Ligand binder design. Structure first.
Ligand SMILES: CCCCCCCCCCCCCCCCCC(=O)OC[C@H](COP(=O)([O-])OCC(O)COP(=O)([O-])OC[C@@H](COC(=O)CCCCCCCCCCCCCCCCC)OC(=O)CCCCCCCCCCCCCCCCC)OC(=O)CCCCCCCCCCCCCCCCC
Ligand SMILES: CCCCCCCCCCCCCCCCCC(=O)OC[C@H](COP(=O)([O-])OCC[N+](C)(C)C)OC(=O)CCCCCCCCCCCCCCCCC
Ligand SMILES: CCCCCCCCCCCCCCCCCC(=O)OC[C@H](COP(=O)([O-])OCC[N+](C)(C)C)OC(=O)CCCCCCCCCCCCCCCCC
Ligand SMILES: CCCCCCCCCCCCCCCCCC(=O)OC[C@H](COP(=O)([O-])OCC[N+](C)(C)C)OC(=O)CCCCCCCCCCCCCCCCC
Ligand SMILES: CCCCCCCCCCCCCCCCCC(=O)OC[C@H](COP(=O)(O)OCCN)OC(=O)CCCCCCCCCCCCCCCCC
Ligand SMILES: CCCCCCCCCCCCCCCCCC(=O)OC[C@H](COP(=O)(O)OCCN)OC(=O)CCCCCCCCCCCCCCCCC
Lengths: 95, 71, 175, 171, 86, 80, 347, 115, 318
């Protein structure tokens, strides 16, 4: 039976370390901060039942910040063509 | 000053990435032109993987692992 | 100019436990751990974890493993201290985790993962820090926030420790 | 899904400030004194709208200010500044408690000739107020649609009807 | 999830299977548990310090403190068990 | 009290002096006049770039030019 | 032991569980578990016999490693899109490891191996404090994290708890063991319903706490570790025994007695949803536990046939052994079925 | 990497010096081997051992007091923040708590060392 | 270039160990009213080379070890730690400048005891075991206290850098702001090394150094090495922590000279203390630490947590 005292007595206990967007010691933005801001802006007043449904797009945006599965896979897709074109010369621009 | 200089440097670098990518990836299996991967288009910081890559690998050593173990 | 050294240290770290966890005696247990843990300093440090790495290099290495090896050394006395047994499945899991670990570092092309645990993703490149913050550790300042913001948290910790004392001695029979 | 657009390479390639951190440090102290009409403004720019590649023009502006600053120190007080940044460049964290003689010496050439009272410990903080003609960005970054929140419970409610309603047990 | 995460998880499960599938020595059990615990320290550290989420950096510390005052308890119960027989 | 403290300070001076350093260390931070100074110092050191705001349509203070005095002044630290 | 220190420990156990209930952060809840272990090791072992030492160890290993597995799941939550809160886990896997972890914390089917053993090792009062109080924290967590629970697991662990754990205890003449296996069965129920309507889970939780409460308290009244002890007390004084048996039938869920109420409501809110077959598959095993317990009810009669009832053991002096609240909980676990419109007071 | 080179060297010279120290004595001019070494009977030095709780408890209290020490270790970073009141309160509180553990164990039969 | 730096660091600490042993024998000699070694070379400067190559050449001498692993582990560890401890010590310049620093030295100093656990473990002699366990006990108990002292005296630096220490020392030696904690930390530095009074011994006694100092021959020239080198260290780290000189850049060798002189004199005071006083019995030692040092360290510590905020000077973390 999860009880909420800390909202009742009006005291913060664990709310400070809870999510990335909280006020930092000397405010330094977290890597994915802004997308926390939009995921909580989307899912704030709703019940996590339909937040699943309707906040999906922006949530997946947040995930793609955190884990970086898709973009990492993209860079990989770049070296995978680069590789087989070491054979067929594309030369290099850089010095 | 350091801020303006820096951000110009990184934008230059990312565009160079864009043109190289454009030359290499011409072929049938088009992902078309260089795109963000997010469902919402707005500025988001580079990964430092995106910036430094294909770079000869010398300065990814000192840039990525450089600061740790000092100079 | 390898610069996979985070991944090499990760691998040796695994190897410590893999070949480690078998054989009957802890006397080599201490060795296996302290090796793997020091390598853990390797990992954490190579992400720039400097203080935290030094704390697993102080508390856990010194305090934990010293107290372990102290009790083990006191509780058990080893005349023979031989090569013993049971290492067979440890080496065979160094082969199954050698082509399984080489399977996750092989199939790592694009994204690699497993069908048992959660997903993973893979590939050769690594993501790290930029956006310098002047005169910040980004860590130790965090722990300064332990003392500033960690009110409730240091309360429950400390209390759980002092209870640590009365429990331990209570079980060692002061009466 | 969305395709990013980045400015033309020639949109970049504006100017140059090439100096060591050492000279740039103390010279920075003085221009941060007299300059900062453009660059604070720049900071509410890229700070307010934040999209580097959006405001870079004003980066051209600040780079202009600093550039002509160093130009004036070139043609105006040259030698004393040179000895000053070369004594501050013996480094070891470049401490300003180290070479003072040419701090007072440098501000002595400057003041004796070009002015520039030194701001000292009051140069900064005191969060600055600045005007900009550009209208503030609204709905910054993504700024999507709202959740369509759920209706809250309202109205006077009376006792329930006939009780627990269970397999039996009326009231 | 990079690679290092995969590998550290495999270490975790090596320690866990080593926990369940060997009852012979008790110190070995307790140990394997503790090594696993170390692996958790490493995970939380690498993650938190990867995302530059600073205010939460305690999780290595306060996760590590109970790696001990609980472990110490473990060894005390080990001694009080050994002096039953041997 | 007097005899008790004389006797515990006759037997175990290390422990008495330890409690003295302790207690005095507890109370003295409350009384001493210099306390607030430390706080105001510690707050006077910026780690993070002061970031400007839209000026027009505001109440005038903390003015644009860094010399214009209307903002806070740590001069009290300049001479102290 | 000191009569203060026990207060300064039990106070910390109460405190720990209160923290597991109150905190909205994971790392805290993990700490609350750590404190309930650290402080609950001294309660067990109170008397220094070796049984309590080996048993307290078997509690300590599986309980502590359970805690660690919990931490692993928490961290995997941090990996996948993550923050530190108490709410639906965003990983299916993290939810898996966490349902296993909270399946060790409290006795469940693959993980129940320790409960009978430790329950017979440690003394009576530690037996009470083990099978009730520490059982409040994990349910208080599951009630929170239920939205991400994979249904197939907790449904499985519930059934296998009822089948295995319930089917057990047959040859057992010991008491503490019987109370253990019954704990695992009521577990199988409370966790069975958990996904559908958790209100009923807290219900069977509370009723269950009253049940084991009067049970163990009676075992303190008549100090009995075996059924033979029960019969010998029947020829010492009757009343405490028939309280033990009637509360055992209430532990079997026999229709007029109050133990039938959680079974009955669980069958409603279980079968108004689609599946009717699984409840019957539970009710069978429930009958099994029953006529076992009613074997323990042919443990007694009058005009008895020979039990070898001995002597010396009439006594002229009543016992002063202090029974804290026996009567209120006795009548409260016998007579409660004519209540429950009151069910909804709980949630 | 630099300090890692220092560790590679400093581990070498250790290894090298050890090796030299093993070679030269059994590389010596004449090495002769006869005498029996009796592991044998229990009373040579000491006998057996009934390992005693005191030392072990010293290891334990070394743990708990470590934990409190390292939990205290970051303080020099924390001594400067914008909340001084709370700082003093919980630093004095924390190490005061350490001293409470010590005071308790010093009140009970623990330590006292002649037994 | 860099390996040149390493060699110039680690070779002179070894030579420093040898000629240190010389100065030891002499100072104890005259302190005892008798001339030290004159008859090996002039004035005694050939004595170490004697001790060195002889003590290397005496043959390995006993017994079956029962562990080939640990026996050749422990010496390597003891050295490697003793050599790498010298890295951060500031000098005019550190040779590795670490942000944390001093707690890194604290940490490795905490690791240094495995050589005692393992060394005393592989004896196969059940008595040298017990002796080793006890020596571990006292070393560890003074790893408790010392840590708290550094965690206090440092709190006037404001950061761990170990460089900024030389910045704090400019106006006044850190001995003045706290003398007593510096006193307790000096005696603490006597602790681990087990210099007299704290040493164990021959004759009748626990004889930890009986088989520890006996056994492993050349590798005893190693444990010998790490012990004395570690001594020179703790003297130097005292010289840096609780006092120091003014660093005049453009001429660092000035500070290097003054630093060197004070450190050497301090070690001289070690060797003559060892001459001076008897030994404590063991329990009286261990619970002498637990009785008195640690409580007063707690008091002084909390007084250094509360003090800097009083006087409003709290140090400037860079
Ligand atoms: C200038 C110096 C100022 C200073 O020192 O300030 C105080 C300083 C911190 O204040 P501060 O730094 O000025 O301000 C901090 C801020 O407020 C920011 O900090 P904060 O906002 O986090 O405040 C935290 C503070 C305030 O904390 C809270 O507000 C959290 C409240 C959480 C909910 C607690 C509900 C308890 C309800 C119990 C009801 C019964 C339970 C069982 C029911 C079923 C029974 C079958 O925490 C505490 O005070 C510690 C927790 C105290 C809990 C007490 C109750 C424990 C449960 C007992 C149950 C009954 C058992 C009886 C025995 C049974 C035997 C059979 O220290 C403290 O407050 C106390 C620290 C030491 C605590 C010792 C506790 C043990 C004492 C001996 C026993
Ligand atoms: C135990 C054996 C099982 C007992 C089950 C009792 C179920 C009673 C259901 C009454 C339903 C109903 O009409 O409720 C609304 C009525 C509404 O009352 P009313 O006044 O509006 O109209 C109906 C009046 N009655 C039902 C009393 C005739 O309220 C009640 O019935 C009172 C509720 C309190 C509970 C009363 C229980 C009486 C029997 C107790 C026997 C206990 C025996 C224990 C072993 C010895
Ligand atoms: C929910 C609440 C769950 C309560 C669990 C039990 C808590 C008491 C623990 C006692 C510990 C102990 O050693 O006791 C031994 C002692 C007797 O053993 P003893 O006398 O040998 O040892 C005790 C030693 N001293 C005195 C030093 C502590 O007391 C008992 O056995 C009495 C137990 C009474 C249990 C009452 C249970 C009430 C349940 C109410 C539920 C209501 C829910 C409402 C929801 C809305
Ligand atoms: C000894 C080194 C001192 C170094 C400097 C520090 C000075 C203060 C040291 C502590 C005072 C010691 C007084 C002697 C008696 C101590 C007895 C004791 O602590 O017993 C444990 C006491 C027991 O109290 P008790 O009520 O059971 O009675 C004493 C019973 N004996 C002695 C048998 C244990 O436990 C507690 O105080 C409860 C937990 C307290 C948690 C921390 C509170 C800190 C203050 C918050 C405001
Ligand atoms: C469904 C609801 C059913 C009713 C639940 C409420 C129970 C209320 C408590 C009943 C207490 C009965 C009592 O006091 O019995 C007396 C006896 C001791 O006698 P006494 O008069 O105290 O004098 C001592 C001299 N021998 O008492 C004793 O020996 C034991 C004393 C017990 C003290 C604790 C009482 C707790 C009261 C609050 C309980 C609230 C529960 C609410 C939730 C219920 C959920 C089911
Ligand atoms: C069978 C046994 C086999 C093994 C035997 C081993 C024998 C020797 C064991 C003792 C020696 C342990 C040495 C540990 C070194 C730790 C270094 C460290 O923590 O350095 C801190 C420093 C922090 O840098 P900082 O100042 O914050 O920043 C610089 C500017 N930004 O950090 C840095 O600057 C970054 C440095 C990162 C370099 C990688 C570190 C890898 C460590 C691997 C340890 C392997 C051995 C483990 C210990 C075994 C103990 C028995």
């Amino acid at each position: 039976p999860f009880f909420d005292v800390q909202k009742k007595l009006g005291v913060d206990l664990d709310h400070w370390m809870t999510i990335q967007s909280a006020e930092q010691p000397h405010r330094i933005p977290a890597r994915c901060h802004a997308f926390e801001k939009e995921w909580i802006e989307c899912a704030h007043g709703i019940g996590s039942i339909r937040a699943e449904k309707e906040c999906k797009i922006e949530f997946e945006d947040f995930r793609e910040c955190l884990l970086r599965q898709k973009t990492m896979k993209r860079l990989n897709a770049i070296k995978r063509q680069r590789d087989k074109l070491i054979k067929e010369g594309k030369y290099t621009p850089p010095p | 000053l350091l801020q303006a200089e820096k951000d110009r440097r990184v934008l230059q670098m990312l565009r160079e990435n864009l043109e190289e990518e454009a030359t290499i990836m011409k072929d049938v299996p088009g992902w078309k032109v260089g795109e963000s991967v997010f469902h919402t288009t707005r500025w988001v910081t580079p990964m430092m993987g995106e910036l430094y890559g294909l770079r000869t690998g010398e300065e990814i050593l000192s840039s990525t692992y450089g600061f740790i173990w000092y100079t | 100019m390898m610069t996979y050294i985070v991944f090499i240290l990760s691998i040796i770290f695994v190897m410590g436990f893999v070949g480690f966890s078998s054989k009957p005696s802890p006397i080599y247990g201490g060795l296996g751990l302290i090796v793997s843990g020091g390598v853990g300093c390797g990992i954490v440090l190579n992400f720039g974890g400097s203080f935290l790495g030094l704390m697993v290099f102080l508390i856990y290495l010194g305090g934990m493993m010293v107290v372990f090896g102290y009790t083990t050394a006191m509780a058990t006395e080893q005349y023979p201290e031989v090569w013993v047994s049971n290492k067979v499945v440890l080496g065979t899991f160094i082969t199954g985790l050698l082509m399984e670990f080489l399977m996750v570092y092989y199939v790592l092309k694009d994204k690699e993962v497993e069908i048992v645990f959660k997903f993973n993703g893979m590939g050769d490149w690594v993501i790290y820090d930029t956006g310098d913050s002047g005169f910040f550790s980004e860590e130790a300042m965090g722990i300064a926030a332990l003392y500033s913001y960690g009110t409730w948290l240091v309360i429950v910790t400390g209390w759980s420790l002092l209870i640590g004392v009365v429990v331990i001695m209570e079980i060692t029979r002061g009466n | 899904p969305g395709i990013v657009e980045l400015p033309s390479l020639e949109d970049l390639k504006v100017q140059e400030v090439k100096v060591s951190s050492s000279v740039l440090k103390a010279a920075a102290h003085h221009y941060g004194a007299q300059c900062d009409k453009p660059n604070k403004e720049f900071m509410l720019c890229r700070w307010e709208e934040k999209d580097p590649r959006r405001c870079l023009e004003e980066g051209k502006l600040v780079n202009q200010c600093a550039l002509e600053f160093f130009r004036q120190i070139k043609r105006h007080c040259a030698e004393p500044f040179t000895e000053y940044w070369t004594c501050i460049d013996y480094s070891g964290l470049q401490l300003f408690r180290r070479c003072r003689k040419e701090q007072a010496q440098f501000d002595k050439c400057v003041l004796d000739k070009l002015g520039w009272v030194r701001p000292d410990l009051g140069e900064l903080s005191k969060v600055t107020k600045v005007k900009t003609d550009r209208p503030l960005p609204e709905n910054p970054y993504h700024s999507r649609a709202r959740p369509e929140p759920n209706p809250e419970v309202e109205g006077d409610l009376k006792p329930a009807r006939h009780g627990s309603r269970l397999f039996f047990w009326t009231m | 999830m990079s690679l290092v995460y995969m590998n550290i998880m495999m270490a975790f499960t090596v320690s866990l299977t080593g926990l369940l599938m060997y009852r012979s020595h008790l110190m070995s059990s307790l140990l394997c548990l503790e090594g696993m615990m170390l692996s958790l320290f490493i995970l939380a550290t690498l993650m938190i310090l990867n995302s530059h989420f600073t205010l939460a950096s305690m999780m290595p510390i306060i996760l590590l403190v109970f790696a001990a005052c609980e472990a110490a308890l473990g060894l005390s119960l080990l001694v009080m068990v050994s002096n039953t027989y041997g | 009290v007097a005899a008790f403290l004389k006797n515990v300070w006759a037997k175990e001076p290390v422990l008495v002096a330890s409690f003295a350093i302790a207690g005095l260390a507890v109370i003295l931070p409350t009384l001493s006049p210099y306390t607030k100074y430390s706080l105001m110092i510690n707050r006077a050191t910026p780690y993070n770039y002061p970031v400007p705001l839209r000026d027009d349509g505001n109440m005038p203070d903390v003015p644009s030019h860094p010399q214009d005095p209307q903002g806070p002044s740590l001069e009290w630290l300049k001479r102290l | 032991m000191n009569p203060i220190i026990l207060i300064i420990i039990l106070m910390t156990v109460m405190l720990g569980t209160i923290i597991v209930m109150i905190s909205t952060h994971w790392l805290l809840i993990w700490i609350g578990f750590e404190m309930n272990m650290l402080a609950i090791i001294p309660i067990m072992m109170k008397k220094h016999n070796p049984r309590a030492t080996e048993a307290s160890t078997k509690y300590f290993l599986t309980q502590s490693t359970a805690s660690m597995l919990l931490m692993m799941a928490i961290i995997i939550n941090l990996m996948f899109s993550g923050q530190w809160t108490v709410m639906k886990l965003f990983n299916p896997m993290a939810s898996m490891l966490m349902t296993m972890a909270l399946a060790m914390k409290l006795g469940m089917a693959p993980f129940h191996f320790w409960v009978p053993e430790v329950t017979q090792g440690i003394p009576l009062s530690s037996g009470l404090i083990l099978l009730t109080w520490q059982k409040l924290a994990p349910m208080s967590v599951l009630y929170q994290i239920l939205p991400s629970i994979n249904l197939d697991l907790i449904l499985t662990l519930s059934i296998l708890s009822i089948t295995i754990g319930g089917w057990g205890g047959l040859n057992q003449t010991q008491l503490r063991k019987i109370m253990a296996y019954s704990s695992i069965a009521h577990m199988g129920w409370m966790t069975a319903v958990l996904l559908y309507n958790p209100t009923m889970t807290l219900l069977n939780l509370i009723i269950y706490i009253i049940m084991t409460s009067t049970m163990f308290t009676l075992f303190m009244a008549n100090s009995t570790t075996t059924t033979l002890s029960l019969s010998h007390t029947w020829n010492k004084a009757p009343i405490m025994t028939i309280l033990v048996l009637i509360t055992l039938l209430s532990m079997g869920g026999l229709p007029p007695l109050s133990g039938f109420m959680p079974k009955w409501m669980i069958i409603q809110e279980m079968t108004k949803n689609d599946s009717i077959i699984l409840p019957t598959l539970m009710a069978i095993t429930a009958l099994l536990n029953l006529y076992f317990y009613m074997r323990l009810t042919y443990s007694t009669a009058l005009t008895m046939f020979p039990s070898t009832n001995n002597m010396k053991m009439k006594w002229q002096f009543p016992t002063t052994k202090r029974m804290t609240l026996l009567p209120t909980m006795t009548v409260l676990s016998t007579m409660l079925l004519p209540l429950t419109p009151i069910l909804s007071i709980l949630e | 990497m630099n300090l890692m080179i220092t560790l590679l060297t400093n581990f070498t010279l250790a290894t090298l010096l050890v090796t030299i120290a093993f070679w030269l004595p059994q590389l010596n001019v004449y090495s002769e081997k006869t005498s029996p070494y009796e592991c044998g009977f229990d009373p040579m030095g000491s006998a057996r051992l009934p390992f005693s709780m005191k030392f072990f408890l010293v290891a334990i209290t070394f743990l708990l007091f470590d934990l409190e020490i390292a939990l205290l270790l970051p303080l020099p970073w924390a001594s400067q923040t914008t909340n001084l009141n709370t700082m003093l309160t919980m630093a004095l509180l924390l190490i005061f708590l350490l001293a409470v553990s010590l005071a308790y164990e010093w009140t009970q039969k623990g330590l006292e060392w002649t037994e | 270039m860099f390996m040149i730096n390493v060699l110039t660091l680690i070779i002179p600490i070894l030579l420093a160990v040898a000629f240190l042993t010389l100065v030891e024998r002499k100072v104890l000699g005259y302190m005892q009213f008798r001339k030290g070694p004159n008859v090996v070379g002039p004035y005694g400067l050939l004595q170490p080379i004697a001790d060195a190559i002889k003590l290397f050449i005496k043959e390995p001498l006993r017994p079956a070890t029962s562990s080939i692993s640990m026996f050749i582990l422990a010496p390597i560890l003891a050295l490697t730690l003793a050599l790498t401890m010298w890295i951060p010590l500031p000098m005019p310049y550190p040779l590795i400048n670490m942000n944390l620093g001093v707690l890194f030295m604290l940490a490795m100093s905490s690791l240094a005891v495995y050589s005692i656990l393992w060394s005393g473990w592989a004896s196969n002699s059940k008595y040298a075991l017990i002796g080793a366990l006890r020596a571990v006990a006292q070393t560890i108990s003074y790893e408790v206290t010392l840590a708290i002292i550094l965690l206090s005296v440092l709190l006037m630096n404001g950061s761990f850098t170990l460089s900024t220490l030389i910045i704090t020392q400019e106006q006044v030696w850190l001995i003045f702001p706290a003398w007593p904690l510096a006193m307790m930390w000096f005696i603490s530095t006597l602790a681990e090394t087990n210099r007299a009074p704290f040493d164990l011994t021959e004759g009748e006694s626990e004889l930890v150094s009986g088989f520890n100092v006996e056994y492993a021959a050349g590798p005893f020239a190693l444990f010998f090495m790490a012990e004395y080198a570690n001594i020179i260290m703790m003297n130097i780290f005292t010289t840096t922590l609780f006092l120091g000189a003014f660093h005049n850049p453009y001429m660092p060798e000035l500070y290097t000279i003054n630093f060197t002189i004070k450190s050497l004199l301090l070690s001289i005071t070690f060797l003559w203390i060892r001459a001076s006083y008897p030994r404590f019995r063991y329990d009286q030692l261990m619970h002498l630490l637990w009785k008195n040092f640690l409580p007063l360290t707690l008091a002084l510590c909390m007084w250094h947590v509360s003090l800097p905020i009083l006087l409003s000077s709290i140090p400037p973390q860079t």
